[PDB]
Enzyme design. Sequence first.
Site, PDB file in Angstrom:
ATOM      1  N   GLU A  48       0.828  -1.204   0.000  1.00  0.00           N
ATOM      2  CA  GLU A  48       0.000   0.000   0.000  1.00  0.00           C
ATOM      3  C   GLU A  48       0.862   1.253   0.000  1.00  0.00           C
ATOM      4  O   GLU A  48       1.776   1.374   0.817  1.00  0.00           O
ATOM      5  CB  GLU A  48      -0.906  -0.006   1.225  1.00  0.00           C
ATOM      6  CG  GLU A  48      -1.817   1.217   1.367  1.00  0.00           C
ATOM      7  CD  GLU A  48      -2.667   1.517   0.138  1.00  0.00           C
ATOM      8  OE1 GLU A  48      -3.402   0.628  -0.334  1.00  0.00           O
ATOM      9  OE2 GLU A  48      -2.613   2.667  -0.368  1.00  0.00           O
ATOM     10  N   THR A  82      -5.930   2.691  -4.781  1.00  0.00           N
ATOM     11  CA  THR A  82      -5.695   1.253  -4.621  1.00  0.00           C
ATOM     12  C   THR A  82      -6.530   0.416  -5.584  1.00  0.00           C
ATOM     13  O   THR A  82      -6.007  -0.486  -6.238  1.00  0.00           O
ATOM     14  CB  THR A  82      -5.963   0.815  -3.172  1.00  0.00           C
ATOM     15  OG1 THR A  82      -5.168   1.623  -2.294  1.00  0.00           O
ATOM     16  CG2 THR A  82      -5.627  -0.651  -2.977  1.00  0.00           C
ATOM     17  N   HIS A 105      -0.850   3.426   4.981  1.00  0.00           N
ATOM     18  CA  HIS A 105      -1.906   4.204   4.352  1.00  0.00           C
ATOM     19  C   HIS A 105      -2.035   5.525   5.078  1.00  0.00           C
ATOM     20  O   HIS A 105      -1.906   5.577   6.300  1.00  0.00           O
ATOM     21  CB  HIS A 105      -3.242   3.460   4.432  1.00  0.00           C
ATOM     22  CG  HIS A 105      -4.311   4.037   3.553  1.00  0.00           C
ATOM     23  ND1 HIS A 105      -4.979   5.208   3.850  1.00  0.00           N
ATOM     24  CD2 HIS A 105      -4.813   3.609   2.371  1.00  0.00           C
ATOM     25  CE1 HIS A 105      -5.853   5.468   2.893  1.00  0.00           C
ATOM     26  NE2 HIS A 105      -5.768   4.517   1.980  1.00  0.00           N
ATOM     27  N   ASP A 131       1.307   0.025  -4.954  1.00  0.00           N
ATOM     28  CA  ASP A 131       0.104   0.283  -5.745  1.00  0.00           C
ATOM     29  C   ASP A 131       0.043   1.656  -6.399  1.00  0.00           C
ATOM     30  O   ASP A 131      -0.360   1.763  -7.562  1.00  0.00           O
ATOM     31  CB  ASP A 131      -1.196  -0.064  -4.998  1.00  0.00           C
ATOM     32  CG  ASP A 131      -1.422   0.749  -3.741  1.00  0.00           C
ATOM     33  OD1 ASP A 131      -0.508   1.441  -3.262  1.00  0.00           O
ATOM     34  OD2 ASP A 131      -2.552   0.681  -3.212  1.00  0.00           O
ATOM     35  N   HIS A 132       0.452   2.693  -5.667  1.00  0.00           N
ATOM     36  CA  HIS A 132       0.394   4.076  -6.136  1.00  0.00           C
ATOM     37  C   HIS A 132       1.175   4.920  -5.137  1.00  0.00           C
ATOM     38  O   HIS A 132       1.609   4.410  -4.099  1.00  0.00           O
ATOM     39  CB  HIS A 132      -1.052   4.584  -6.235  1.00  0.00           C
ATOM     40  CG  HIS A 132      -1.829   4.394  -4.977  1.00  0.00           C
ATOM     41  ND1 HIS A 132      -1.625   5.151  -3.844  1.00  0.00           N
ATOM     42  CD2 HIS A 132      -2.770   3.479  -4.652  1.00  0.00           C
ATOM     43  CE1 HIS A 132      -2.430   4.728  -2.883  1.00  0.00           C
ATOM     44  NE2 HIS A 132      -3.130   3.710  -3.348  1.00  0.00           N
TER      45      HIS A 132
HETATM   46 MN   LIG Z   1      -3.729   2.188  -1.921  1.00  0.00          MN
END
Ligand SMILES: [Mn+2]
EC number: 2.7.8.-
Length: 424
Positions: free
Chosen positions: A38, A83, A199, A258-259
């Site tokens: 994440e 996500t 996150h 993911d990003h």
């Molecule tokens: Mn994410």
Amino acid sequence: SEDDLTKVLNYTKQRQTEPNPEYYGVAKKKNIIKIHLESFQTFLINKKVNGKEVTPFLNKLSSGKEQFTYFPNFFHQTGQGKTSDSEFTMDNSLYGLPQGSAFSLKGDNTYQSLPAILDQKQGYKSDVMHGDYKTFWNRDQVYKHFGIDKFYDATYYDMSDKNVVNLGLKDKIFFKDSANYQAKMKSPFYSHLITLTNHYPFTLDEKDATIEKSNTGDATVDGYIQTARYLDEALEEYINDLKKKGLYDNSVIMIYGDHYGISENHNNAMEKLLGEKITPAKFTDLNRTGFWIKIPGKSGGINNEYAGQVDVMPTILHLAGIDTKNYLMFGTDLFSKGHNQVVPFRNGDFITKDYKYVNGKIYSNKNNELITTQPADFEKNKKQVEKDLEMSDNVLNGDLFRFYKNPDFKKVNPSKYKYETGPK
Ligand SMILES: [Mn+2]
């Protein structure tokens, strides 16, 4: 409407590449473990804070000496779905939407997804595991359309206060329990572990932290250091567990961020952390989110190919030995000589090996200095980028797979998929 589909199918043909014979089918019917990191950006790789390595395990993997092939020039291509956009692209080789979330808005579309292909062609069972509840980001509906067989959501874990932080289950508990679930599975399986602790706002209980925050003064950047370390440790222990359970050597294992976790809002602090001004070109460079892949029987290393998440699906299919000529995909196989080394971004920016196109300006990747004379392949690449995004959007907006009688795909009946509440 069938004509609209035909136009996209025809468009996707030219880029198709033949598998590399060194890699073609080498992972046929082997378990595939897909580990999501994440909000992970590779600026963390080899980074020290107060003299401590933030991500020491990933640093080892990134050396290329630990059986993983690391791609240091690997970019997410997500938009507002964050996500869920990454998930969408990873399993479909399609872009998310320019605005909003494809998962939320296009959850009842027809898809011809990677897990369904693996299931149909090679008898895989596909699962997702995640320490949050199944209807967040509309996953419950979307996964049925993707043909995912099982979803170990938060009801499969102990969600008591001691085990949770921020959005849900702590990554260390998550990985420990998930490895135990995986050990009970029949082969071949395709298992996607979606993490959660790293996150925004990047908060971690002091008791759980093993590195001090950076001292930029930006609470987001400073907290990110701790959650990233925590995730690295969780991953390290997960790999240990796979080795103990005999699920390491003979699995394809992929790891990916993911990003981005740190937006442009944090440019002041990121300049302090990284020791350079975060220009638009530099921010684009920081969208590297990483790909690491271990393939049984193959050595690791470092592969400098510029690539995006759209490229993962054709890579996996070729590793399995599956012919992909009939799949509507925008990416190309990472290991193929013909891999298309152009990475579209959702906002119309893009990157190639030699240059990046950012907010209407071209910069050399060597120094991020403005290029005043338009590169020879620029018009071609810009056109490809624009058209890729438009063509992908046409599939989603037109729900175009409804019209595709694909000889290599049996239409998914989403009503055949149901995710039972877990024992916890
Ligand atoms: Mn994410």
